[PDB]
Amino acid sequence: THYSRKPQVSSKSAKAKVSDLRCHYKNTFETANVINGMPLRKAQQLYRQVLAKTRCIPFKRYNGKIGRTAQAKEWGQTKGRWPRKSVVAMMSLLKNAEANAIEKGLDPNQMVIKHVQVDQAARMRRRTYRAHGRITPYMCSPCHVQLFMSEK
């Protein structure tokens, strides 16, 4: 799962990624995309406020027949959610990215996220049992997440 884009200045950037996360791809897709252009500290604050349920993750693409909320108005939407499993996974990834920036000698307070990509990982198979003795797939959809941030 290589990085699809390269940073403008490599020495002033930090990279982080995770493969086969075992989080729902669609929920993680929405969670990671909202921080694409944000400063690292602002992204961390938003995730904490999502866990506190004072702010929400806007669901822009995979939002078919989900509920509506007022907390999505700040993103220009009406449908949003609070996917805590995706959120805590993304916060761990941000911590790894911050550690990489610290290791390279950069200041995390000045790091701005520049690239966020979420991909559909290989699917894990389970089965569910249906009426009239039918067996039917019960699939798990993990995701690949990659990001990098650069000093502003």
The contact set with Mg ion (CB under 5 A) reads 65, 67, 129, 133
The entry of Mg ion, RNA, none near residue 12 (CB within 5 to 8 angstroms by kind) is none
Write out the DSSP string of the chain. ---SS--SSSTTEEEEEESS--S-HHHHHHHHHTTTTSBHHHHHHHHHHHHTTSS-EE-SSS-TT--B-GGGGGGT-SBEE--HHHHHHHHHHHHHHHHHHHHHT--GGGEEEEEEEEEE-PPEEEEEEETTTEEEEEEE--EEEEEEEEE-
The entry of Mg ion, RNA, none near residue 30 (CB within 5 to 8 angstroms by kind) is none
Closest approach, Cβ 71 to RNA, in A, equals 10
47 is in an annotated binding site: no
The entry of RNA, Mg ion, none near residue 26 (CB within 5 to 8 angstroms by kind) is RNA
134 binds RNA (CB under 7 A): yes
65 binds RNA (CB under 7 A): yes
Map the footprint of RNA across residues 93-122, applying CB under 7 A: 95-96, 99-100, 103-104, 109, 115-122
Instruction: Tell me the number of residues near RNA by CB under 7 A.
Output: 87
* Residue with the two structure tokens 């989900």: 66
Which segments are annotated as binding site for Mg(2+)? 129
